[model samples]
Target: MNIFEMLRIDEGLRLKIYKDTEGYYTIGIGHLLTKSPSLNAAKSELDKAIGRNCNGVITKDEAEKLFNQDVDAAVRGILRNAKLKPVYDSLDAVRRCALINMVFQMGETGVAGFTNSLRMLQQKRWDEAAAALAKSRWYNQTPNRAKRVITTFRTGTWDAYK
Candidate 1:
């Protein structure tokens, strides 16, 4: 398999804050949860390989570059999945982005575990899918984000929940 596919099978994509195996608060791919060191007195150069800006954490443009790379890898990882490809390709950019966000947050296997929700999505049962998304531990963990993703699934708009 290619590198993107390898990453999917290995690191898995992640959008939300989660604790890694080592128990470090992590986000966006495998970025360690920590203050953006650029803000410190050192002001060292940033690396695109690692960045952390979610959860209202402030980051510099360099961090954004890193974020972009992470996003690209995440998208690639999603597209690489044969099972999810048809569903992903059939949706519009808005819905595709919603699915991508899901993969980013849950990883491919975690998303697959939402079998009922995936079934609803496959059948285009927008309301059911949204409800299924809402009725999950993930929703309990991140209600506001769940609302935004559910809104996108229910209403095809790209409005993000702030």
Candidate 2:
């Protein structure tokens, strides 16, 4: 599977509001609506994203649109991260997708916190990159997903996604 399809598997398709593990409202393949906003603002944003006429559900078309935009944003976010420029430019297609997937979940600023891993990855120290990832709460929070991503980093292959 490709990166986008792999992300679909990892994040899943949701047509309505579902609170994530950290309590933020998420929907449509991990599209985060809002983070602890007032109920009015939160619901408003979600409603605006898809529509208000549908009550709380979104059509498949709406979901896919959101996914595409989100994926685009995440890819751009990774490319623009200065700390990750060398690492991003140096990685293989599989590894690049893995990195972009990380950005999808964590955003640029969040993943940018992985200074050691970023530095190691820049140097093509795959083992150290995997090791650093395993040490983070980000890893423990989503062990299954993290394991696959870490394996991708360590091996620089699409086998994990496949």
Candidate 3:
């Protein structure tokens, strides 16, 4: 299978901001770090950073190309640094996608912090795994998105956050 497909399968498509694994600001499948002005939300912010007036907009096709590049780097980073690749490879599509998104949100280092959830997942305890997520600050901070992810874990369906 292609790397692009693997990333797309794992990272649900979105055009918004979400907290990364460390509870830091991020955006897109790329997890564009908010610490960097380049990924900031305001066109004014980006323009100020670059000392030019620029529109921060692009066509869907351009976004897809950009997403591919971002996810490509993310996948490589996960491969190089994520310790749970075997666990990642063993899960079903829905679970795999959920975990990958978690990893993407937090990085491998960040996902490692979810000890109970990871343990429950390794044990195939879907209910407990979902519960672990529900109890987490991640869920607390982004309840809507976390609910969507927990639902995917509880039921093997691919539901993106609205």
Candidate 4:
């Protein structure tokens, strides 16, 4: 599966301004625009960011551009970690994209903290690795997405969207 396409459904596409679960003003497939506490403040920040009143929606082309950039950055960030690079090299495309999807949402540093899980992954102990991840705050916070990723790790299949 195309990583960007997978993320589109996982992140959900948004043409107009919307409040995230955390009440942050985000748009264009999880593109976070502000951390302002209030909706009015977030709207102001968004206006300043785009250099205009943003009642007009973001185009699909623009959203994809941003998504691509973010995905690429996640890949780069994952590879840049010296210890993780070798493990990543040993993984298949599905696992690679799973890591990218995770780091895209959780940040590379946050994912790197999974030393035990990473070791299990490096050893190709699939279910063990998934079990380790299942016992994480990441799992508690985003259980559905975590299950999808964990399932991919265990089975080495592109079943995240299922």
Best by lDDT: 2
Off by over 4 Å in 3: 1-33, 36-55, 159-162
The sequence of per-residue lDDT tens digits that candidate 2 reaches over residues 103-149 is 89988898899999989988899998899989999988999999998
RMSD of each: 9.5, 1.5, 5.7, 2.2
lDDT (Cα atoms) of all candidates against the true structure = 0.62, 0.85, 0.61, 0.81
Candidate 1 runs further than 4 Å off: 1-23, 27-59, 160-162
TM-score-wise, the better of 3 and 4 is 4
Better of 3 and 4 by lDDT: 4
Minimal lDDT window, size 10, model 1: 39-48
Positional deviation of residue 49's Cα in model 3 after best superposition, in angstroms: 13
> Looking at model 2, which ten-residue stretch has the lowest summed lDDT?
36-45
> What C-alpha lDDT, on a 0 to 100 scale, does residue 65 get in candidate 3?
59
Error of 3 at 126 (Å): 0.7
Residues 5-61 of candidate 3: C-alpha lDDT, one tens digit per residue: 545554545444455555544434543435543444555543443344545443345
Model 2: how far is 71 from its true place, Å? Answer: 0.6
TM-score of candidate 1 versus the correct structure, residues matched by position: 0.64
Clashing pairs in 2: none
> How well does model 4 score by local distance difference test?
0.81
Clashes, model 3: 2
TM-score of each model, paired residue for residue:
0.64, 0.93, 0.65, 0.87
